[PDB]
Write a protein that binds this ligand. Structure first.
Ligand SMILES: Nc1ncnc2c1ncn2[C@@H]1O[C@H](COP(=O)(O)OP(=O)(O)O)[C@@H](O)[C@H]1O
Ligand SMILES: [Mg+2]
Ligand SMILES: [Mg+2]
Length: 212
């Protein structure tokens, strides 16, 4: 009754919009977690402003064609990327959207492959990648996506599993990055990414994030 076998451009737009709203609602929390590389209190603000730049382009130029919608989202992120986290987020989504540029809709396997493509783009963009960060969480989420999509057609079930595994990775970040364990926090960039992913899931279920 509620399975998602294909994601068109409007469903992707909904994922973007609900992910952006969920991040906005949690931006102050994500800011306060920020300790790496400097505790300058801005991860949530940076990611929120970057995501908002993408969301605004999407809201003004919707399409049934997921590839075209992805081009619109990607351009918005890339012209408004703020801070280390916003730049990395924009590169994750640049690679994700490039992977689907020629599609009108995608299935669960192409969704998983697009997460992986985003990870590859983001790691290549960062000259000195550090583990325990948004890169680690994205990498572990994408590996989970590939494994699960191999026998899961339903994108809701797939995204639920991605979130379980992304949360496990996020909770493991202090075991990779010393300052996180010393201060007693998880990685702020990774937390912001989880906020986006949890909005993706709401949209796949046809639900909306309540605006704080
Ligand atoms: N070298 C790096 N490798 C991977 N992720 C990084 C790196 N540097 C920063 N990050 C990510 O960026 C987050 C901090 O984002 P942000 O506060 O926007 O950065 P800044 O304020 O230093 O520009 C970190 O929690 C981490 O997820
Ligand atoms: Mg900063
Ligand atoms: Mg910061």
């Amino acid at each position: 009754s509620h399975m998602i076998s294909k994601i068109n451009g409007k469903l992707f737009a909904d994922m973007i919009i609900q992910g952006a709203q969920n991040l906005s609602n949690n931006a102050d929390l994500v800011d306060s977690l920020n300790v790496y590389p400097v505790p300058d209190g801005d991860t949530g603000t940076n990611m929120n402003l970057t995501m908002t730049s993408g969301r605004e382009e999407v809201e003004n130029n919707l399409s049934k064609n997921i590839g075209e919608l992805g081009k619109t989202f990607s351009k918005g992120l890339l012209m408004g990327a703020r801070g280390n986290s916003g730049v990395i987020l924009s590169q994750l989504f640049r690679g994700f959207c490039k992977n689907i540029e020629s599609e009108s809709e995608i299935n669960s396997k192409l969704l998983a492959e697009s997460f992986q493509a985003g990870v590859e783009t983001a790691y290549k963009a960062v000259m000195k990648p550090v583990e325990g960060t948004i890169l680690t969480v994205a990498k572990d989420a994408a590996q989970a996506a590939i494994e699960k999509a191999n026998n899961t057609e339903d994108c809701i079930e797939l995204m639920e599993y991605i979130i379980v595994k992304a949360n496990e990775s996020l909770e493991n970040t202090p075991n990779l990055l010393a300052v996180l364990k010393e201060v007693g926090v998880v990685d702020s960039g990774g937390k912001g990414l989880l906020c986006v992913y949890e909005g993706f899931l709401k949209a796949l279920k046809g639900e909306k994030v309540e605006a704080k």
